[PDB]
Structure 1
């Protein structure tokens, strides 16, 4: 119960890295969240905008 101070520091840094990695699944308005997928669906100038 008292060690929650040290466990919270371990938990916060783990949640922050999992959030940073999960944000690679996001589109941000692009046609796909996968970078090779964009490069296959579209030609050079349209792919560059996505």
Structure 2
């Protein structure tokens, strides 16, 4: 029970990690940057989450 619940906690905690993007929040990257540069930041959160 502990190992499944610690694994599911680490999995959600990893949304809020930056992976070298300029924010962990996908709405910061969307609202702050324009599409030419925002996509190159989003691919860091995609490849991190993935």
For structure 2, the 5+ residue unaligned runs are 42-50
More RCO (CA 8 Å, sep 6+):
2
Scaled by the length of structure 2, what TM-score is found? 0.79
For structure 1, the 5+ residue unaligned runs are 1-9
Choose which of 15, 18, 23 in structure 1 pairs with 2:14: 23
Larger-Rg structure? 1
Q: 4+ residue runs of structure 1 moved beyond 3 angstroms?
A: none
Aligned residues: CA RMSD: 0.4
Q: How many residues align?
A: 41
Scaled by the length of structure 1, what TM-score is found? 0.79
